Design brief:
heterotrimer; A mainly beta (182); B mainly beta (561); C mainly beta (185); A: 182 residues; mainly beta; Immunoglobulin-like; 2 domains; 19 strands; C: Immunoglobulin-like; four-stranded antiparallel beta sheet; Receptor tyrosine-protein kinase erbB-3 (chain B); IgG H chain (chain A); transferase
Amino acid sequence: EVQLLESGGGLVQPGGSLRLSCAASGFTFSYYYMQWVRQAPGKGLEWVSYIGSSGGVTNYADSVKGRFTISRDNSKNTLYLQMNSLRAEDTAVYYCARVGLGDAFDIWGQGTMVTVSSASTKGPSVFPLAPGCLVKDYFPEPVTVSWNSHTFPAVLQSSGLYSLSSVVCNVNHKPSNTKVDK
Amino acid sequence: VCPGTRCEVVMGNLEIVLTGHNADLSFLQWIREVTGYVLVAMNEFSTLPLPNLRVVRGTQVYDGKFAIFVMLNYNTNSSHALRQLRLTQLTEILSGGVYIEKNDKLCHMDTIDWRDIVRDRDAEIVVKDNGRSCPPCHEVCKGRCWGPGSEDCQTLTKTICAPQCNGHCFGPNPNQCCHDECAGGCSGPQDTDCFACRHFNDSGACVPRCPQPLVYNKLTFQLEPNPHTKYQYGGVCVASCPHNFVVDQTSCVRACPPDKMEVDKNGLKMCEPCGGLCPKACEGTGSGSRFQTVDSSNIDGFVNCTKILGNLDFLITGLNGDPWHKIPALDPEKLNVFRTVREITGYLNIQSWPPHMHNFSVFSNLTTIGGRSLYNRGFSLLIMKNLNVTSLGFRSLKEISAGRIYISANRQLCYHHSLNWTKVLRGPTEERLDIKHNRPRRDCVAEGKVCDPLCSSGGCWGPGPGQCLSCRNYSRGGVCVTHCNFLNGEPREFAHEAECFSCHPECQPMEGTATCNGSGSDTCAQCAHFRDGPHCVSSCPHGVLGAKGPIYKYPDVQNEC
Amino acid sequence: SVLTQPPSASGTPGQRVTISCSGSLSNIGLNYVSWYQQLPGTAPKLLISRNNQRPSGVPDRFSGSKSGTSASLAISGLRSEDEADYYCAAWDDSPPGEAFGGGTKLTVLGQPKAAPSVTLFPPSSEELQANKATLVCLISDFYPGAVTVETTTPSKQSNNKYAASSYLSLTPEQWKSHRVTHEGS
């Protein structure tokens, strides 16, 4: 059906580059302008860029101008976004929207999360409290903390790490292959 | 600043009618000035707390004679009634009278010198039939008071003074009168010692005009944005305009004038002059509109329209008329309504055109075609089967942002063969151009139906130097000229981006050399009158204000301020 | 190049709420206004297009309007399914781009006001012997989801209530140097 399928996102480091893809289907991709809108976790909707139907006009936000480059392949029905020199403040959920009648964004993508973090993978240090368990400093999310054989969502630490707690235990961190009980 | 019926100034009328035994009137504790009248009728509370109320103007009055109207504030059965009118700082009443009657339990009203509070000598003051069992004022009040307290005394101010100060004075001595910007009496001779302001107020200092946004700078002998630059918000000078309010040069108006637009240069929204016709978006025709084409019923709704949020379909049905004789034919003269249209967001579809109109010079001011809405099979511009159109006539058209171009079956169309669409059609041309089967190229060349010699290798929209895409030399009013009025002619002109512009006035026509270098008066060879610094003005600063005050200087012999 | 929306909006099941949207002549003044609804954990969808048009799926409850350089979003008949983020957008001319709004967080009440049950855990003894002594403050069961005490954002539970957690990283030396609000704490 009428669908804008996105791809190309993932975890990357500052300075790194990424190319986002947006495959169209169900409509004539060559007849519409296409948009890029990102949304940082906690922040609101932020306009990134847009391109003409024939790939003519191209304007960017001052936050990305020079680093990002929008393009399109009408023969392949795909909208691209060349994200170079990525900063930490570029971490967001990048949606691609089609302009419709009256320049309204009637069709959006599914999400594709883009993350720019300096902190690499790390082991979850567990420290048991006094009369549940505590999962401190781990990356990246998530961790399945189940007792034997209500859990609060982790916080975004100032170091880019995460700190999860559980109250009433098995703490398995798959990205670090860490299976430690305490 | 607050509306009538917290703040400090009450813009409107303070009306309190029919209130219960107990009411949180503590929100009225901070009120300094009332612009209208005070209405307190049929209430049941015991005290009206307005201790900071110093001035009640009275631009409009209740019962056509009273700036203060208080009556019937009691009950025939209950014991809840108005007993105290806490107006401990009530100093002046610029206009209107006072009516305090039928207040059964209200005391200390028959002891107030209202002639000192009321400034209008012809006003009516009726204070009677009030409290009966009323105790004397405090020994401090000296007979006149508002309540049984040491801080509830009436402060007398008004005093007959010298004819040098007509009414507005702070004592009998001539060297103790008020300022010219004082609405009534005052406390001192300074501008920061008045009861009420006659015009505005910077921060306690009544000035006839708030700090001008454009003041004179001692550095560059001209004008510059002022540090304060307080704007007029009615009666209070503010450096920043209120919520949503736009800055109208010197005033904070709710909405921009009909002859001005809401520009936003240095951050804040400012009302700048349109300079001709203000920008206006309009509903168009096509997929998403109300109509299949423009016609006798749509042509009138395009007046003063500069932007088309949509498209413009021109069908034979719209021109010739409705098949069911419902809507009459379109008067070709009414087509001139699109001469204001500068931009079309969607497409332009011209499938029909008046036979005696050999071009689209109606759209001679059309600048941009977006193509955000396409016609047929992805077209932004479709001109088909117009056997009368000799030339296009889109002289102002510089950009077609997207979509394809369909131009066919026009048979008599010329001047478009030499057009370099790449310099107009944004995006890789590829196969977006569908231009064929018009007037044969060989036929146009033979009859001289080609671009004017003063046009560059770009192309043209018709005959003459006015229909050129790019001039070989310069342009003057949309017309390709070989020379600008650099060294001779009137008015003397200069050049910018291959376009001619007239030099600033007060710059005499310099023969042999260039008169101007730029648009402003900062760039001239010499001044035709006076020269205030690096500028050329017709008159030295007669009475302009700067950061300190009025600035003026005599023409120093060789005409230099 | 941003449109101005109120940061928050509240109402009860069956009440009419309004979401205004300020702008300029560059954006709203010469272009169509569109509203976008974003349910928690989902992608935003088109709610209002071209000033006042509703797509097949948007009820007659929602109604957008435009007057000058400003626009509004009216929701007559509030429901517990309307609880989401509302953004307004408009094409901008002089700076060629899309002018988005800051965002409006519509909160649908209905549920009775509840006080959060705070559970604080002193620094772990196993942690205290590891050059650290972080505090663990757990917040649970409260409505509406808005509590000020790094700290997490209020998380909606399966109990239709909200939860939160606040951590305090410190030094073991400063730990023994010395021996949650919900609108009416």
